[PDB]
Amino acid sequence: QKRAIYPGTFDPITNGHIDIVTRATQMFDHVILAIAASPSKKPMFTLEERVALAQQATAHLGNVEVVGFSDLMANFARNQHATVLIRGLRAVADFEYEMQLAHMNRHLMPELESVFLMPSKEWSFISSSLVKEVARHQGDVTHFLPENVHQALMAKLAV
Amino acid sequence: QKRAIYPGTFDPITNGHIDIVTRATQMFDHVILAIAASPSKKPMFTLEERVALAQQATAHLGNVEVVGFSDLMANFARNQHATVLIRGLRAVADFEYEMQLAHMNRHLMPELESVFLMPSKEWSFISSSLVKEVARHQGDVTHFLPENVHQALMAKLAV
Amino acid sequence: QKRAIYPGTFDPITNGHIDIVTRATQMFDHVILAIAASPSKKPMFTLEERVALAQQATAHLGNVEVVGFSDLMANFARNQHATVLIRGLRAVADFEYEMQLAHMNRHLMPELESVFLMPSKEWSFISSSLVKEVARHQGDVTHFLPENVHQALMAKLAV
Amino acid sequence: QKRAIYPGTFDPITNGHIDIVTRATQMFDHVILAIAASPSKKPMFTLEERVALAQQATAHLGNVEVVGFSDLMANFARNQHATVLIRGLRAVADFEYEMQLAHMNRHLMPELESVFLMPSKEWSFISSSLVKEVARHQGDVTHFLPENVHQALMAKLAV
Amino acid sequence: QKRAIYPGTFDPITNGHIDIVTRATQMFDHVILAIAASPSKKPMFTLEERVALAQQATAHLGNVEVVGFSDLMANFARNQHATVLIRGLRAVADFEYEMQLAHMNRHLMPELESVFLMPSKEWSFISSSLVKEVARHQGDVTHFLPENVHQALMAKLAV
Amino acid sequence: QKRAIYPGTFDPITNGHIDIVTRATQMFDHVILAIAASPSKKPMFTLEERVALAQQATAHLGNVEVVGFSDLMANFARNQHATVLIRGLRAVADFEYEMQLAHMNRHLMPELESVFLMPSKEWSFISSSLVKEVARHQGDVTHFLPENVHQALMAKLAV
Numbered sequence: 001q002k003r004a005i006y007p008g009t010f011d012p013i014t015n016g017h018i019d020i021v022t023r024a025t026q027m028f029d030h031v032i033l034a035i036a037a038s039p040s041k042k043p044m045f046t047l048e049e050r051v052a053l054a055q056q057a058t059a060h061l062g063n064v065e066v067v068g069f070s071d072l073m074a075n076f077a078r079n080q081h082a083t084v085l086i087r088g089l090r091a092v093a094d095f096e097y098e099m100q101l102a103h104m105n106r107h108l109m110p111e112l113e114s115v116f117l118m119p120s121k122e123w124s125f126i127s128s129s130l131v132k133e134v135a136r137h138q139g140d141v142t143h144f145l146p147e148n149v150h151q152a153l154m155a156k157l158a159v
Numbered sequence: 160q161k162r163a164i165y166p167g168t169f170d171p172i173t174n175g176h177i178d179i180v181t182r183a184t185q186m187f188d189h190v191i192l193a194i195a196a197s198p199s200k201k202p203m204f205t206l207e208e209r210v211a212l213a214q215q216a217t218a219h220l221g222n223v224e225v226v227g228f229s230d231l232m233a234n235f236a237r238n239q240h241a242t243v244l245i246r247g248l249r250a251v252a253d254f255e256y257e258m259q260l261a262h263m264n265r266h267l268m269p270e271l272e273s274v275f276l277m278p279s280k281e282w283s284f285i286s287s288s289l290v291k292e293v294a295r296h297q298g299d300v301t302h303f304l305p306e307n308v309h310q311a312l313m314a315k316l317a318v
Numbered sequence: 319q320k321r322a323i324y325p326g327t328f329d330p331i332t333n334g335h336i337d338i339v340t341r342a343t344q345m346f347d348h349v350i351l352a353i354a355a356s357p358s359k360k361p362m363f364t365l366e367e368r369v370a371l372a373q374q375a376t377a378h379l380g381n382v383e384v385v386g387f388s389d390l391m392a393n394f395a396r397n398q399h400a401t402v403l404i405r406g407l408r409a410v411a412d413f414e415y416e417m418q419l420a421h422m423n424r425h426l427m428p429e430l431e432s433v434f435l436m437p438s439k440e441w442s443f444i445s446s447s448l449v450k451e452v453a454r455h456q457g458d459v460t461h462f463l464p465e466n467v468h469q470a471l472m473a474k475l476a477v
Numbered sequence: 478q479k480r481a482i483y484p485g486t487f488d489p490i491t492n493g494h495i496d497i498v499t500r501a502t503q504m505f506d507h508v509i510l511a512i513a514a515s516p517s518k519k520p521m522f523t524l525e526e527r528v529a530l531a532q533q534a535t536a537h538l539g540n541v542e543v544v545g546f547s548d549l550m551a552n553f554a555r556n557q558h559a560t561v562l563i564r565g566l567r568a569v570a571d572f573e574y575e576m577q578l579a580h581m582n583r584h585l586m587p588e589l590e591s592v593f594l595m596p597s598k599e600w601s602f603i604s605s606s607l608v609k610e611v612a613r614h615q616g617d618v619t620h621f622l623p624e625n626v627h628q629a630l631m632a633k634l635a636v
Numbered sequence: 637q638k639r640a641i642y643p644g645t646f647d648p649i650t651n652g653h654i655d656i657v658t659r660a661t662q663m664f665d666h667v668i669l670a671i672a673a674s675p676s677k678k679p680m681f682t683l684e685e686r687v688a689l690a691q692q693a694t695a696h697l698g699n700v701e702v703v704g705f706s707d708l709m710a711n712f713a714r715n716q717h718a719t720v721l722i723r724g725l726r727a728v729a730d731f732e733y734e735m736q737l738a739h740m741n742r743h744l745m746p747e748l749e750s751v752f753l754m755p756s757k758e759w760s761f762i763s764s765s766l767v768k769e770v771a772r773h774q775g776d777v778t779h780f781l782p783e784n785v786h787q788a789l790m791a792k793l794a795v
Numbered sequence: 796q797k798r799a800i801y802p803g804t805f806d807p808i809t810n811g812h813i814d815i816v817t818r819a820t821q822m823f824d825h826v827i828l829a830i831a832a833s834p835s836k837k838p839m840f841t842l843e844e845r846v847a848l849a850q851q852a853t854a855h856l857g858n859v860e861v862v863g864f865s866d867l868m869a870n871f872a873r874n875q876h877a878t879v880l881i882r883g884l885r886a887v888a889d890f891e892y893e894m895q896l897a898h899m900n901r902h903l904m905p906e907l908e909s910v911f912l913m914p915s916k917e918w919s920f921i922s923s924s925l926v927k928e929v930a931r932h933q934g935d936v937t938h939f940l941p942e943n944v945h946q947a948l949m950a951k952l953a954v
């Protein structure tokens with residue numbers, strides 16, 4: 001009945017993302033983990049890779065649905081019959097950008113309510129960007145990623 | 160099914176608060192607007208005034224319950240069987256303090272989720288303290304308050 | 319007599335920019351809207367496009383002069399006999415970068431005073447970057463741009 | 478023609494304030510240095526002390542007028558026929574509070590423009606409160622104050 | 637050879653403080669844990685209580701010296717022949733205020749270097765004030781304090 | 796005996812960097828100025844150029860060692876037997892990113908203590924990026940760079 005969308009680039013999905021979507025499923029009946037194509041960010045993993053990684057990483061959560069999209073997130077939320085948009089908040093830079101996004105999304109879809117969750121202390125200082133940078137220099141990021149994602153990141157960089 | 164609390168001092172309740180609680184009622188089945196006694200900040204309105212003002216200002220919202228409390232926010236939420244704690248986010252200063260409170264509340268009550276809502280642009284720059292400061296110095300705050308609150312504030316300041 | 323420069327990339331000029339330059343004209347006798355070439359930012363519109371867009375968008379303001387430039391803004395301000403440099407302030411990230419810029423410009427031209435204006439609430443959460451991103455995904459940005467700019471942005475993306 | 482007000486508590490006026498008001502006088506025809514009674518913060522110097530100190534410290538500026546006021550900043554600016562309100566910006570904490578005040582002042586007096594000036598690097602880390610705190614604890618604040626203010630502060634602290 | 641001071645009110649000392657001072661002892665030969673009398677903030681524990689609590693809580697650290705002081709931090713560091721001043725950084729609000737203090741301390745004592753340490757994620761969201769606030773309102777703060785401090789806090793709050 | 800690493804891209808090294816490393820040498824017995832290859836940032840100067848520039852710029856400091864590296868900084872610090880990692884803190888954006896880095900480095904090398912220094916007021920608003928931008932537009936940056944670096948930057952841009 002209550003449907004929420006959790007959009008992001010998820011390049012790749014981290015334990016921080018896993019924490020947020022898990023909390024979302026404890027709050028709403030159905031959660032769409034929505035992976036934006038984000039070509040402007042030149043992602044390391046293709047959209048199809050990121051969807052598969054997230055599907056495996058969230059298979060244990062019964063009310064999570066992983067979908068990729070290139071639409072405007074506001075339209076995609078409407079077309080998923082979502083009335084809640086989930087984002088995790090990490091730092092001041094996040095907050096300020098999320099504010100901009102939320103006000104734009106409110107303009108585009110006024111009945112879509114943006115709600116923010118604060119991550120666990122364990123994940124409050126990591127990001128996909130940071131994890132990739134450490135991995136690019138062969139540092140150990142097993143603690144920060146789902147097993148399947150760590151394998152795929154290692155495999156990716158080994159090529 | 161989902162019970163949420165929206166705690167604060169509400170000294171007095173503003174249109175920013177009304178915006179946040181209205182958004183909350185569109186998200187959750189039952190919202191407790193929880194008014195802290197907050198003696199340490201020496202509020203302008205008494206607790207009984209603040210509760211009465213907030214009840215009148217939210218009477219049109221069918222699933223809002225206005226309740227006073229003097230306990231720790233987490234203790235009151237636990238006793239009310241609430242699993243969601245609503246907070247509005249205004250500025251960076253908000254965010255950092257709310258981050259603190261959220262991590263403390265997660266420690267005190269792990270089954271309580273803190274969710275942050277974003278106010279309309281219309282109310283993004285006001286607070287109870289700013290409204291009181293302007294009104295005390297003979298500025299016009301009509302636009303920022305429910306009618307009943309505006310009347311009570313004028314009466315208060317006329318001493 | 320009092321001459322001010324309002325420099326920026328204006329890729330493209332938004333209603334937020336229009337608000338700032340309009341306020342500038344209410345404060346100073348002559349305002350130079352100065353469009354930096356900004357090749358490092360790889361702008362969507364060429365400098366000649368951006369100048370024409372801004373000229374049309376500000377034609378109703380009698381004391382606005384639109385000029386493009388690739389010089390150091392401090393030298394360009396001196397060569398325009400400007401003693402005030404206008405910038406609009408939006409978020410914390412803006413403020414911190416504008417501070418850096420102002421201190422550098424003060425080093426380069428000590429008699430050029432940098433003054434900052436805060437935008438209307440309506441435009442406090444938009445930017446050229448955000449508007450382009452929404453438009454790239456076919457979202458409606460008519461509310462955020464001058465008519466001529468919206469047409470040109472639509473036309474640009476339709477190719 | 479252009480009348481600007483520079484309001485504050487100036488308890489006491491520092492070289493940071495002198496820097497800001499000096500820059501203002503180079504921008505606008507007439508600058509009112511407006512000293513708030515500010516009883517709620519319990520100032521160290523009385524209003525008559527603060528006005529006298531500021532007058533002496535700005536006597537070399539021909540187009541500065543030092544005036545005390547107890548009204549709302551917007552009410553005083555309106556009554557003084559000022560169309561510019563000067564504020565100095567120091568840090569992020571400044572910025573966010575000044576943003577609030579600016580939006581409130583625009584609501585209260587739309588014909589009043591808030592303009593923000595940036596202090597010299599020399600004064601970017603001081604405030605009246607910090608200076609008083611250092612001086613009270615037997616630290617050297619000579620570098621941060623006009624001579625007349627430094628003398629009065631020593632006299633005050635000798636009690 | 638290197639003497640460092642770690643000043644604060646420590647009202648009361650928390651596991652965050654213990655973390656910072658422990659890291660300091662691993663960096664410098666001798667660390668003075670300097671407890672400010674700080675009457676202006678009206679501390680919950682007296683100075684003699686705060687010193688006694690901190691001594692017990694740091695007895696396992698061989699190169700820590702706990703000392704009370706009522707002078708300016710810079711004056712005390714000079715008199716203790718310390719050339720390093722330790723401060724912990726928690727949030728953005730910390731950072732900006734510490735930046736101020738550091739620039740003032742460099743002016744007052746140029747031969748004193750301010751170094752900023754970062755607390756563990758475990759303690760990154762707590763402070764003495766937050767701990768007192770939670771404990772006063774019947775919240776569990778056992779995890780955040782040394783055992784001896786927890787006992788003294790309970791005793792204090794039982795009044 | 797006490798060994799510290801000061802890592803960064805140093806593209807090119809500025810007087811701000813010189814201030815930080817100089818302060819580091821006043822605090823620790825041996826300082827490794829470590830220049831990260833940073834190919835993702837597409838540096839203006841090659842690693843070998845940046846090392847030579849930094850060597851010349853720090854030749855007057857007896858206990859500075861300039862080394863380039865492409866390793867993970869945490870591993871490089873271990874392999875240099877460094878137990879302190881120095882970073883200068885400039886703005887809020889710096890602080891938030893440095894926090895992320897420090898927590899990651901603590902995960903990778905728990906006995907490596909990250910310590911932050913606040914730069915002199917003179918250099919608190921400059922960066923390699925800003926200096927390059929001014930130089931690209933033929934503005935005078937002699938005040939911000941060591942002589943040898945200014946020459947090399949001029950030479951670079953003259954080609």
Ligand SMILES: Cc1nc2cccc(O)c2[nH]1
Nearest residue numbers: 071072073074104105455
């Ligand atoms: C892909 C995408 N970028 C956006 C930016 C703002 C609002 C939206 O709905 C957006 N969707």
Ligand SMILES: Cc1nc2cccc(O)c2[nH]1
Nearest residue numbers: 230231232233263264773
């Ligand atoms: C009254 C009150 N102060 C708090 C501080 C932290 C957490 C809480 O739940 C609190 N409740």
Ligand SMILES: Cc1nc2cccc(O)c2[nH]1
Nearest residue numbers: 389390391392422423932
């Ligand atoms: C194009 C341009 N970038 C600048 C950076 C700093 C100062 C200036 O005057 C600048 N002009």
Ligand SMILES: Cc1nc2cccc(O)c2[nH]1
Nearest residue numbers: 296548549550551581582
């Ligand atoms: C004394 C005073 N407090 C204010 C708050 C907001 C706006 C104003 O103009 C104010 N004046």
Ligand SMILES: Cc1nc2cccc(O)c2[nH]1
Nearest residue numbers: 614707708709710740741
């Ligand atoms: C007690 C005290 N307040 C201070 C403020 C600035 C610098 C210092 O060294 C201080 N010490």
Ligand SMILES: Cc1nc2cccc(O)c2[nH]1
Nearest residue numbers: 137866867868869899900
């Ligand atoms: C080159 C490099 N990037 C890093 C990011 C995090 C930690 C490290 O140790 C790093 N080293």
Ligand SMILES: [Cl-]
Nearest residue numbers: 197198199200
């Ligand atoms: Cl209380």
Ligand SMILES: [Cl-]
Nearest residue numbers: 515516517518
């Ligand atoms: Cl007052």
Ligand SMILES: [Cl-]
Nearest residue numbers: 674675676677
């Ligand atoms: Cl004190």
